[PDB]
Design an enzyme around this catalytic site. Structure first.
Site, PDB file in Angstrom:
ATOM      1  N   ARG A 251       0.833  -1.196   0.000  1.00 33.41           N
ATOM      2  CA  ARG A 251       0.000   0.000   0.000  1.00 33.41           C
ATOM      3  C   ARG A 251       0.872   1.252   0.000  1.00 33.41           C
ATOM      4  NH1 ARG A 251      -3.519  -1.946   4.968  1.00 33.41           N
ATOM      5  NH2 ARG A 251      -1.290  -2.250   5.432  1.00 33.41           N
ATOM      6  N   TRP A 260      -2.022  10.279  10.123  1.00 33.06           N
ATOM      7  CA  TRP A 260      -2.014   9.536  11.389  1.00 33.06           C
ATOM      8  C   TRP A 260      -1.109  10.252  12.390  1.00 33.06           C
ATOM      9  CZ3 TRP A 260      -5.130   5.371   9.954  1.00 33.06           C
ATOM     10  CH2 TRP A 260      -5.554   4.537  10.998  1.00 33.06           C
ATOM     11  N   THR A 388       0.319  -6.870  16.884  1.00 37.89           N
ATOM     12  CA  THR A 388       0.291  -6.696  15.420  1.00 37.89           C
ATOM     13  C   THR A 388      -0.578  -5.505  14.947  1.00 37.89           C
ATOM     14  OG1 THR A 388      -1.467  -8.347  15.019  1.00 37.89           O
ATOM     15  CG2 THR A 388       0.806  -9.143  15.018  1.00 37.89           C
ATOM     16  N   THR A 389      -1.210  -4.796  15.884  1.00 37.40           N
ATOM     17  CA  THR A 389      -1.846  -3.524  15.565  1.00 37.40           C
ATOM     18  C   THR A 389      -0.747  -2.522  15.267  1.00 37.40           C
ATOM     19  OG1 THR A 389      -1.739  -2.623  17.808  1.00 37.40           O
ATOM     20  CG2 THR A 389      -3.666  -3.956  17.233  1.00 37.40           C
ATOM     21  N   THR A 390       0.419  -2.774  15.860  1.00 34.83           N
ATOM     22  CA  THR A 390       1.584  -1.889  15.810  1.00 34.83           C
ATOM     23  C   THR A 390       1.473  -0.802  16.859  1.00 34.83           C
ATOM     24  OG1 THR A 390       0.794  -0.148  14.316  1.00 34.83           O
ATOM     25  CG2 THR A 390       1.650  -2.185  13.288  1.00 34.83           C
ATOM     26  N   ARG A 428      -7.271  -3.034  17.747  1.00 27.90           N
ATOM     27  CA  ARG A 428      -7.389  -4.437  17.361  1.00 27.90           C
ATOM     28  C   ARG A 428      -8.828  -4.800  17.035  1.00 27.90           C
ATOM     29  NH1 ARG A 428      -4.199  -6.813  15.122  1.00 27.90           N
ATOM     30  NH2 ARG A 428      -5.918  -6.692  13.620  1.00 27.90           N
ATOM     31  N   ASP A 431     -10.282  -2.894  13.927  1.00 27.62           N
ATOM     32  CA  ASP A 431      -9.722  -3.385  12.677  1.00 27.62           C
ATOM     33  C   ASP A 431     -10.313  -4.738  12.310  1.00 27.62           C
ATOM     34  OD1 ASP A 431      -7.249  -3.082  10.608  1.00 27.62           O
ATOM     35  OD2 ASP A 431      -7.401  -5.171  11.283  1.00 27.62           O
ATOM     36  N   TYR A 507     -12.030   4.216  10.948  1.00 26.19           N
ATOM     37  CA  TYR A 507     -12.856   3.039  10.720  1.00 26.19           C
ATOM     38  C   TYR A 507     -14.310   3.363  11.017  1.00 26.19           C
ATOM     39  CZ  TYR A 507      -8.600   0.287  10.202  1.00 26.19           C
ATOM     40  OH  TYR A 507      -7.385  -0.200   9.763  1.00 26.19           O
ATOM     41  N   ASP A 512     -12.293  -0.075   6.379  1.00 29.24           N
ATOM     42  CA  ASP A 512     -10.849   0.142   6.478  1.00 29.24           C
ATOM     43  C   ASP A 512     -10.402   1.407   5.732  1.00 29.24           C
ATOM     44  OD1 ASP A 512      -8.087   0.040   6.721  1.00 29.24           O
ATOM     45  OD2 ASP A 512      -7.835  -1.771   5.519  1.00 29.24           O
ATOM     46  N   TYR A 514      -7.907   3.208   5.971  1.00 29.66           N
ATOM     47  CA  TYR A 514      -6.494   3.340   5.643  1.00 29.66           C
ATOM     48  C   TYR A 514      -6.199   2.666   4.313  1.00 29.66           C
ATOM     49  CZ  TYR A 514      -1.446   2.828   5.700  1.00 29.66           C
ATOM     50  OH  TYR A 514      -0.107   2.881   5.378  1.00 29.66           O
TER      51      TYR A 514
HETATM   52  C1  LIG Z   1      -4.959  -0.639  11.263  1.00 25.09           C
HETATM   53  C2  LIG Z   1      -3.543  -0.754  11.715  1.00 25.09           C
HETATM   54  C3  LIG Z   1      -2.930  -1.942  11.657  1.00 25.09           C
HETATM   55  C4  LIG Z   1      -2.791  -2.660  10.331  1.00 25.09           C
HETATM   56  C5  LIG Z   1      -1.755  -1.966   9.553  1.00 25.09           C
HETATM   57  C6  LIG Z   1      -0.472  -1.926  10.079  1.00 25.09           C
HETATM   58  C7  LIG Z   1       0.327  -0.812   9.882  1.00 25.09           C
HETATM   59  C8  LIG Z   1      -0.144   0.253   9.117  1.00 25.09           C
HETATM   60  C9  LIG Z   1      -1.357   0.132   8.434  1.00 25.09           C
HETATM   61  C10 LIG Z   1      -2.155  -0.990   8.640  1.00 25.09           C
HETATM   62  N1  LIG Z   1       0.282   1.520   9.437  1.00 25.09           N
HETATM   63  C11 LIG Z   1      -0.289   2.679   9.970  1.00 25.09           C
HETATM   64  C12 LIG Z   1      -1.174   2.337  11.133  1.00 25.09           C
HETATM   65  C13 LIG Z   1      -0.630   2.419  12.530  1.00 25.09           C
HETATM   66  C14 LIG Z   1      -2.483   2.215  10.970  1.00 25.09           C
HETATM   67  C15 LIG Z   1      -3.315   1.776  12.159  1.00 25.09           C
HETATM   68  C16 LIG Z   1      -2.943   0.362  12.530  1.00 25.09           C
HETATM   69 MG   LIG Z   2      -8.307  -7.525  11.029  1.00 23.84          MG
END
Ligand SMILES: C/C1=C\Cc2ccc(cc2)NC/C(C)=C/CC1
Ligand SMILES: [Mg+2]
Ligand SMILES: [Mg+2]
Length: 535
Positions: A251, A260, A388-390, A428, A431, A507, A512, A514
């Site tokens: 992406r 963000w 894994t959400t980061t 989490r 998403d 969201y 989604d 993003y």
């Molecule tokens: C929705 C998110 C987790 C999935 C994913 C990982 C990392 C990125 C995008 C998607 N980067 C930017 C972030 C932190 C978005 C929110 C976290």
């Molecule tokens: Mg998911």
């Protein structure tokens, strides 16, 4: 290396690549603001103001997005109001008092709302015709902690009656109300709400204060000049490494990533911090796509391994394309080390790195589960899916650029304090609700919602709801985490609260935003980073 990803490409092209600040406009704007700032300060310090007029003053300055100039002033006044347990007790004024103090960490008792409830603990329906009261109750209801069961119906009460009243209200109240029902103030992104309040509401107010309005407009437009500079400089950094073409499976969302970062903090003093942060967000987004939309079970192992070892010597062990990600990653962190060397805060990068290693491990686990078709119980799923959400990672990263962040602040964060876990859970759970269908049709069996259905033995919808509860519990925990005394200074709590806000805002309506920025993010990015506010 063979999955066809249907990632829409960047909406923006190069439109953000060049921005040349009009230094004369900037200096003009800056000069007038000094004056408006001072007038506004004296407004706050005015003596013998009614309670309700002081709270409306602070609220308006806050909603106009200029409150960061008067942190001390606004604090001293709220402190004073807190310690007074006051005697202006109409619904409107009480709910606003409650909200402002609570948002500032003042544990004002929710007993203030008893005078508005029957003997059954239900809000008096006789209040259903007090629209300003209902609106402030509504906003207040979103700052509940677990101690505030007394407010358990404030949200349904105020909502049903705002809905019913809205269509006959004058403007712009009708629009304020309608917007509040769609997006409450407490959980919205600050720049987003501020831009909406200034242009759509305050500017169309009959009673609007002209000094505050001009102030709000100049400030917003001036900060926007800075953000545009930051974004441009960040856009060239993203350009001069060309994952656009090099890593076409991923992406391409650096503008969305800057948004963000901007949601996490917008203040000018956090410019260094925003730029570091958005770089990390971009990079981690790449890794995420790598595990999830391209690389093989075999290649991911080499990747994780290399990340854990964290030395360039390992590149050769990685396929040609992972060498790109991997080196960029390693460089980015040496860059950070350089930027922080100046101030001798260079060691702190390791906290962010440790959290990145953690994220990758859990990415690799998530992948193993996918191959094996493993559907964990929710307990085990969460133990892996939270990181894994980061979000543990981004929150830690958000402190790098913050000049006042100390080792004790990172040592608090590292322990996974409750406010951070809550923010992580919200991300989490949101998403997972938003991405249930698309991932399920793409052969996903480890989906959070599946684990939840299979574990508890409940429908796709029953599982949707349990997840909503977790998020709602989580907000109550965030709200409780802001109350004094705070484990670290408030400045280090706000980014975590802001991370929670951004996921709610992105969201919204369960999509989604993003991965598909067009519907929701695009308008925000336009309003925040393309269009100035018309003076
Ligand atoms: C929705 C998110 C987790 C999935 C994913 C990982 C990392 C990125 C995008 C998607 N980067 C930017 C972030 C932190 C978005 C929110 C976290
Ligand atoms: Mg998911
Ligand atoms: Mg993913």
């Amino acid at each position: 290396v063979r999955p066809v990803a249907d990632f829409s490409p960047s909406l923006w092209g190069d439109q953000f690549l060049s921005f040349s600040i009009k230094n004369q406009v900037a200096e003009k704007y800056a000069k007038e603001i000094e004056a408006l700032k001072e007038q506004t300060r004296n407004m706050l310090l005015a003596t013998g103001m009614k309670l309700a007029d002081t709270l409306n003053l602070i609220d308006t300055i806050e909603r106009l997005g200029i409150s960061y100039h008067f942190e001390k002033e606004i604090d001293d006044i709220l402190d004073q109001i807190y310690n007074q347990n006051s005697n202006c007790n109409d619904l409107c004024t009480s709910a606003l008092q409650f909200r402002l103090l609570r948002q500032h960490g003042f544990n004002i008792s929710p007993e203030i709302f008893s005078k508005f409830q029957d003997e059954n603990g239900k809000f008096k329906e006789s209040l259903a015709s007090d629209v300003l009261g209902l609106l402030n109750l509504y906003e207040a209801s979103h700052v509940r902690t677990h101690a505030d069961d007394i407010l358990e119906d404030a949200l349904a009460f105020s909502t049903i009656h705002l809905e019913s009243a809205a269509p006959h209200l004058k403007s712009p109240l009708r629009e304020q109300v309608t917007h509040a029902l769609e997006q409450c103030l407490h959980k919205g992104v600050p720049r987003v709400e501020t831009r909406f309040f200034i242009s759509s509401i305050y500017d169309k107010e009959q009673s609007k204060n002209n000094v505050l309005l001009r102030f709000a407009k100049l400030d917003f437009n001036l900060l926007q000049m800075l953000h545009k500079q930051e974004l441009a400089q960040v856009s060239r950094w993203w350009k001069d490494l060309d994952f656009v073409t090099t890593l076409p499976y991923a992406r391409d969302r650096v503008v969305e990533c800057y948004f963000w970062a901007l949601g996490v903090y917008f203040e000018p003093q956090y410019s260094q911090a925003r730029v570091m942060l958005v770089k990390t967000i971009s990079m981690i987004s790449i890794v995420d796509d790598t595990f999830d939309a391209y690389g093989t079970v075999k290649e991911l192992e080499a990747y994780t391994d290399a990340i854990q070892r964290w030395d360039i010597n390992e590149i050769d062990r990685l396929p040609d394309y992972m060498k790109i990600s991997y080196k960029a990653i390693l460089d980015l962190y040496k860059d950070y080390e350089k930027e922080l060397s100046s101030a001798g805060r260079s060691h702190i990068v390791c906290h962010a790195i440790e959290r990145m290693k953690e994220v990758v491990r859990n990415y690799n686990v998530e992948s193993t589960w996918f191959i094996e078709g493993y559907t964990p119980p929710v307990s085990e799923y969460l133990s892996n899916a939270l990181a894994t959400t980061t979000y543990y990672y981004l929150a830690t990263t958000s402190y790098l650029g913050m000049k006042s962040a100390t080792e004790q602040d990172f040592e608090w964060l590292s322990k996974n304090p409750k406010i951070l876990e809550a923010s992580v859970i919200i991300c989490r759970v949101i998403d997972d609700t938003a991405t249930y269908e698309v991932e399920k049709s793409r052969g996903q069996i480890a989906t959070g919602i599946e684990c939840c259905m299979r574990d508890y033995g409940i429908s796709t919808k029953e599982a949707m709801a349990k997840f909503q509860n977790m998020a709602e519990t989580a907000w109550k925990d965030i709200n409780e985490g802001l109350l004094r005394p705070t484990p670290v200074s408030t400045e280090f709590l706000t980014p975590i609260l802001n991370l929670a806000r951004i996921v709610e805002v992105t969201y919204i309506h369960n999509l989604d935003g993003y991965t598909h920025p067009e519907k929701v993010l695009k308008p925000h990015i336009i309003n925040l980073l393309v269009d100035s506010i018309k003076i």
